[model samples]
Target: SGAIYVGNYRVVNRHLATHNDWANLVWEDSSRDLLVSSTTAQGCDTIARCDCQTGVYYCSSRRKHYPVSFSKPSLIFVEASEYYPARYQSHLMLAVGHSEPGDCGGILRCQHGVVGIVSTGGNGLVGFADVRDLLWLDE
Candidate 1:
């Protein structure tokens, strides 16, 4: 039984996604909540040819970029082995997942075993209650 460590919180059970591209875990705080984001630019043009002669410009191919977002203050976890090419073996990365609304409604993907803190929303958030620290537990 493998587990993931997010700061001092140790997660034992894995929450998998059904039709989504990335998996995530939700943390609900009774008195307060949290959130996190990658802040990468996405759905934008990379390069374009500008001409001032006739106010005309030609744009080349557009590159698709993915950004990550956490809503309602929760911890997000991603596994590289679950993806197609097994990417993000090293370093932390955020990709596209799902979308909702507003600035914090977008779903983001990250590296396997990567931990993030969602810093948005307030009160009444939902999550697990049995998370414990492995260092403090008796082996």
Candidate 2:
């Protein structure tokens, strides 16, 4: 088992955790109409999502290291040549923006609907994940 701590600044703390020879974390905001952000890496740049009620949003990160016989839980292995280490300009995002269907009540019901905002450097937008309180947890 492992422990994950989510705080004001998405600084993930992994402990007693066993990684599949590779490690990556994904965070999403379901309460936003348009998710805006900058590049977390360079080359491939896009922020796509679905506002279609029946649709599902998809986001993924390429797992690179040593190839194995079977893929791990969320680890997807690709060719070494295709391996692109995430840099300051790499951005992986998705959003239900104005171009998409309006999920006014669902996504923009409240005023604190500021979705993830990628900084100029590359770190994911960080803040209180849950609205209940300002407490941090070890998951």
Candidate 3:
């Protein structure tokens, strides 16, 4: 239950781990519009762009635009054991931000959560959950 502000848009992170595909997870607005970003599932990097009014989203990696899939959104919590190296233990999180003209290298904040670099490029804002302090099972 957190929000990320991008310009005039209010984005939220829905920790839904049900889907492994980044394209499936997204942030939606009151109008049922969806936003999407592209990034590695292991918390590497991401890039995206969205136009809530037009219901259009652009993923730089795919170099194309796609419509949002409609479904009931749910939250999924993350645990440290999910990662192999143990160093990559961040949970899957989604942020809903307004569509604005800018690159993806700014400060993204989330209340009741931590923020880390999830995407890099000159397209959209991308981020990931910081789980570095989570206690490892083998520890």
How well is each residue in 1-139 modelled by candidate 2, as lDDT tens digits? 1111222122211111124212443332222111212224332212212122111211212111111121111112211212123322222232222211111112111122221221111122111111112122112
Off by over 4 Å in 3: 1-54, 77-139
Which candidate number maximizes TM-score? 3
lDDT of 1 by residue, 1-139 (tens): 1233333233322222222212332332222222111112222211111111111111111122233332322233322332223222111222223221122212222332123221122232212212212222212
lDDT of 2: 0.20
Residue 16, model 2, lDDT = 17
lDDT of 3 by residue, 5-107 (tens): 3322222222222243234443322111122333332332222222111123344444444332211122323223221222322233344433222222222
Per-prediction TM-score to the true structure, in the order listed: 0.17, 0.15, 0.21
Ranking, TM-score, top scorer first: 3, 1, 2
C-alpha displacement of 73 in model 2, angstroms? 2.0
Score candidate 1 by TM-score against the native: 0.17
What order do candidates take by lDDT, descending? 3, 1, 2
| Model 2: worst 10 consecutive residues (lDDT sum) | 100-109
Cα error of candidate 2 at position 123, Å = 28
